[PDB]
Homo-oligomer: A and B are copies of this chain.
């Protein structure tokens, strides 16, 4: 098994390319209200979970919900790519505002895997350049995560490692 220890007061930030399996992973390990998805927020504001033109509004809503949850001391999982430092920054800041611990969970899978999964999706597929870009951004992000303020940094390096994950929620 791959045991990932997290405090009750965690902001768990999933970091991974489109096609890396973030949403599937979130559903497997967490209750629906614990997971706040950027795509779901695109849906909330626009009726379209895949409308990229409303990204600004979607993240405003996501950050607002994250703020309310952490204020109430509720463990929260951010299901978005989080592969740009500028995306992670407000999440860290909000977590610190409410004395919650940022946790990074990185889907460090080969680009080929994500591309194959994307090609086999029966839902929204992205163009190949999106996944190539996201993967490069994810890999460039790994080294600096602790310094950004992530108190726990967990890297998953293969589908086997992802599958072996067990979260251990320390009370």
Q: B-contacting residues of A (Cβ < 8 Å)?
A: 2-3, 5, 143, 146-147, 151-155, 157, 161, 170
Copies in the complex: 2
A154 lies within 8 A of B161 (CB): no
Q: Which residues of B contact A152 (CB under 8 A)?
A: 5, 152
Say whether chain A's binding surface is mostly helix, strand, loop, or mixed: strand
Chain B proximity of A85: nearest CB distance (Å): 16
- Partner pick for A157 among B2, B5, B143, B170, CB 8 A cutoff: B143
CA distance A9 to B96 in the complex (A): 27
Chain B proximity of A105: nearest CB distance (Å): 11
B147 lies within 8 A of A157 (CB): yes
CA distance A155 to B147 in the complex (A): 9
Q: Which residues of B contact A5 (CB under 8 A)?
A: 151-152
Nearest chain B residue, comparing its CB with the CB of A160: B147
CA distance A93 to B12 in the complex (A): 29
Chain B proximity of A20: nearest CB distance (Å): 17
CA distance A157 to B147 in the complex (A): 9
Nearest chain B residue, comparing its CB with the CB of A144: B157
CA distance A167 to B156 in the complex (A): 25
Q: Which residues of B contact A154 (CB under 8 A)?
A: 146
